[PDB]
Amino acid sequence: SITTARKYLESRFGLGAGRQDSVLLMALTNEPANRLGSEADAKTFFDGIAQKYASSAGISLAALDALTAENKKLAKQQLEVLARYLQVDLNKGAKSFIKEKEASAVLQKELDLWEAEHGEFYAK
């Protein structure tokens, strides 16, 4: 019956109501010209019709880097020795970044002592 088609199209090959809606319509255009013998034939026909339906809709069912890292290993070693020559600190910005980041963590630790004590409505 039609109940078996739902579990053989929307279930077997995964075909829900909407999927089977246009799946059973494709059979008409190519209905079996005679009473189908095998129960698998019907499923096969449905599956065969599903292919067309799916088609119709278009929805079917090394060391190079080791050589590279040694090149940057040379240039990183060359970068430190030129910064050593020109007396350029390569981390003066980074050391002052982490030293103000704990300094702005101190004033944050003082700023939330106000809002924990007083509250959000009073502070706003």
């Binding site: 075909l15 829900g16 909407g18 999927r19 246009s22 929805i59 069912l61």
Partner: peptide
């Protein structure tokens, strides 16, 4: 599978 009515 997308249920298409």
């Amino acid at each position: 599978i997308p249920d298409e009515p």
